[PDB]
Every structure is written in C-alpha cells, then in structure tokens.
Design a protein around this ligand. Structure first.
Ligand code: SF4
Lengths: 270, 270
C-alpha cells in the first residue's frame, strides 16, 4: 500500500487534479482511498458525484460520539470503486484542522480501512498554511510520498517551497519524501520552464504539466472527473500520463528548500 | 483606541485593501498600528516600502527568547507615522499560526506599544482556515471590530460566511462584532449587488465597494499604497471613502451565517 498526500495552495485546482489523478488510477484497476483534509475544497465531489460528502467530524457530532459511527456512514465508494472520506474542517474560530484528521485516521485504523486491499491512499491536504495541524497525515506516519500541486505564480511557488520545508522537518526523523511537483497550468508564458527550474533547485522533478482545458470545468459542473465525463478527451490522456508516472515513480527525495532571494530571482527572470 | 481586524480569504487583495485603508486613516491624521497575522501576505510592505518586514517569531528564534528583542527590532514606522509589526507564520510543518500572534500581542503590550496615543489597531488576518489559531486576536480580547474583505467569487463569499461563524462562537464572551463586508472588486457582473445581498443575509452591510483600478497594482509593484503613490487618483478617494465610513461606523452586529443551500441560491440568482 502506497501512502501518499497531495499538498498545494488553494484556488489553483489542486483537488480537481487530485480527483482526476485518482480517477485515472482507478481506470488502471488501482484500488484507491481519498481522505479529504482541505476545508477550502470538496476532495471527493468528482468521485462520489456528491455536492458535499458528510464529514467524520460532522457525523461524530450528529451521533454525539465517534465509536457509535459505522464505517458505511464515513467511507463511500464512487467512480472505479474509489473509497472516499472527508475529515471535516476545524470548528469555526475554535478548532484545529489536525483534530479532524487525527479522528479520521484513528477511526479508519480501528475499523480496518487500511488493510482492505488498497494500492494507494491519497490525503488531499490544504497548503495555504504550513502548520502542525495540516501536517497531521505526515505526523501520524500515514503519508510517505508527497506530491505538490503548484503553478507559475508567486504564492503557488512560495507554498511549494514552504511545504518542502515541512517535509525536511519530518524527513530529518522519519520516512516522508517529496515525489515531485505537479504544474496546474494557468495558461502562462512558458510556465512549465518556471516549475521545472523550481523542481531542479528543490532536487525533485516536475512529474507532470496539467494543461488548461475547457473540458475540466465542463466535467466539474457535472460533479465528475474528465476521466469519467469524456474518456476520449486529450485532457483525459493528460491525467492518464500523470497517473502512469506516479505508479512508476522511484524519485522520492528529501527536498532542498530555497531562500526568498532565490525564489524572487526566479520570478523576476520569468 | 479602536481594536479592529480585517479577515478574508487569500489571493483577493485583502492585505492591499488593509494597507490602503490604513494609509487613508493616517492621511486623515489618525494614529494607526498594523499587526500582520497573514502568512500568505506582506501586511506592512506597502507602508514600510520593504519587501518582507522582519517578524517577531524570526527575530525571537534567532535571539533565543522574545525578552531579548527590543521594541525597535519589531515595531517600524512607515508612511504617515503608521506603526508596523509582523507576527511571523508557523514554523513549517510543526508550528501554529496562533503562536506568532499571541507572541506579538504579549510583546507589544509588555513593551507599551498599545499605551501610545493610537486611534486604531488593525490585525491583518488570513481567513483561508477559520481555526482557533487565526482566531487569536479575538480570543485575547484584542480585536472588537471585524471587517471581512470578500469578492463576487464563490470561495471569497464562503470564507466570509465561515469567518462570520467564528465571530458567533465568541459573541457571548466579549464585544467582538462584525462591522461590515468590504468588496474587493474582481469585475464580476453585478458584483456590488451580490455582496450587498450577502451582507443583508448575514445581518451586516457592504461598508464599501473597492473598484478594480490598475493604479493599485502600479503602486503595489513599487511597494506603496495608492494614497502615497498617487494621492490625486480616483482610487485614492475610494480608500478615503472606506476610511471615513469605518471611522463613522456604528453598525456592529452578531452576524447570521447562511447554509450552503442559501449561498448557492444567491450565486445562481446572479
Ligand atoms: S495548528 Fe494550524 S490548523 Fe491548527 S489551530 Fe494552529 S494554525 Fe490552525
């Protein structure tokens, strides 16, 4: 079982790429579980065809405790038998994103979710704040292979660099590695070269450049992946290519985060 | 002294609006302090003309303890006498954003930084994650008047709703109240009407509509507010109008957060 996480800042299509990647993996007959850890995205919407899956935190509140919850309530099968669960974001103003994630992981462990013939687990994690709360899947030794979704944009590359700093902290004392950068295209001048340059400075790879395509939005609107919406689409082959490279990936490194001076010089050059 | 906070999702110019508002208040002769609590923005860059102000956490870590810091290391004067401090984001992968914010507040209090003849303090706070960490200004009873920056985009309005839920949690514990929505225009059709409609559902007001104007970006690239860069600009009068309405504001409410179904109804009605 390969224990993976996708990190990246919000507003650049990270969860869309995660779900289209996972759909592409299921299409190859890989048994995949998605654990949603992102309060700014619906991590399972495009797999389950559901506007917002009920979260572990929500249904522990509704039933009043977590030992009363049944796995059937929490873990739902969608496209290609992909198993979907949502941790549930922090209680507004009071909670920590880490509480939902710890609760989800402990519940899935207890209930046997991790020994049920899985090829991949993907934690879909928000990278807007690189705090201990959003590090929970790594802290719990539940994600060893990290892929970072970024774009040729200052804040997406800053987030990629800061996520890399977090990986080094848990890699100085354990098993977590960076598997690569995924570039979600923003239809930008030679954008691929910018993310390749960043990958080269970090000591990783740009594992795929995901193009901008109308078909992604068209599929999103119908609450599905491009893989399911339009399987013969050119964009469907883009996610298949990414999925094939993840499956075959051996390049799992301790990254070399860069200085703000280095990042600024990169951005100014491009 | 009026203790205010600006909350809002990242990537919509919240910190640009905060600094332009504060520069307009300083131009009017108001004595203002900005406390940066946003790891996705430089909260003081446009006031100090400096790319990244040294943060209290960075300087504390270096010096061993916060008690070894001098106030002048932390608190810098910029455009119009505006005093500027940055909390410093979480230690990547391990820290909590709340730690920098409590460290900054406690240091400023002890050093007499709030004893000065200030008219306003503005906490510039990220609203991407409405956790206990980012709620610290409210929890330490240090921000009473909340203004939410949003736009006519789904996730900006979702964040405004989530921030409102955080305010409700503390509304019976102290004088923390919502003063209004500030619309940072993204040139959406009927954007002003959409945010007026949202404010009315929440039980507040759209206190000001900030237009899209390239002079904002021309000032920002030169690390300035429009107020300093081009005080004769139409856009400078927009920030002056917002500043005067905040000064005169008497509408401070316990907001009424909406359901996702209510939010979706709004979005489709526009
Ligand atoms: S650790 Fe992160 S998510 Fe948890 S409260 Fe702190 S900032 Fe928020």
């Amino acid at each position: 079982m390969r224990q993976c996480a996708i990190y990246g800042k919000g507003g650049i299509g990270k969860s869309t790429t995660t779900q289209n990647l996972v759909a592409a993996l299921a299409e190859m007959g890989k048994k995949v579980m998605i654990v949603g850890c992102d309060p700014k995205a619906d991590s399972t919407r495009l797999i389950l065809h559901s506007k917002a899956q009920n979260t572990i935190m929500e249904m522990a509140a509704e039933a009043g405790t977590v030992e009363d919850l049944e796995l059937e309530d929490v873990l739902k099968a969608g496209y290609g038998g992909v198993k979907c669960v949502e941790s549930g974001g922090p209680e507004p103003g009071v909670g920590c994103a880490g509480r939902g994630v710890i609760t989800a992981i402990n519940f899935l462990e207890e209930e046997g979710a991790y020994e049920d013939d899985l090829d991949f687990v993907f934690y879909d994690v928000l990278g807007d704040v690189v705090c201990g709360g959003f590090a929970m899947p790594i802290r719990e030794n539940k994600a060893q292979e990290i892929y970072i979704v970024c774009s040729g944009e200052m804040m997406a590359m800053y987030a990629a660099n800061n996520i890399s700093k977090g990986i080094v902290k848990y890699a100085n004392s354990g098993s977590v590695r960076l598997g690569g950068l995924i570039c979600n295209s923003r239809n930008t001048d030679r954008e691929d070269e910018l993310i390749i340059a960043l990958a080269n400075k970090l000591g990783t790879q740009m594992i795929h450049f995901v193009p901008r395509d109308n078909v992604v939005q068209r599929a999103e609107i119908r609450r599905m992946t491009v893989i399911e919406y339009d399987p013969k689409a050119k964009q469907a082959d883009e996610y298949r290519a990414l999925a094939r490279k993840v499956v075959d990936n051996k390049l799992l490194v301790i990254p070399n985060p860069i200085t703000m001076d280095e990042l600024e010089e990169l951005l100014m050059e491009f």
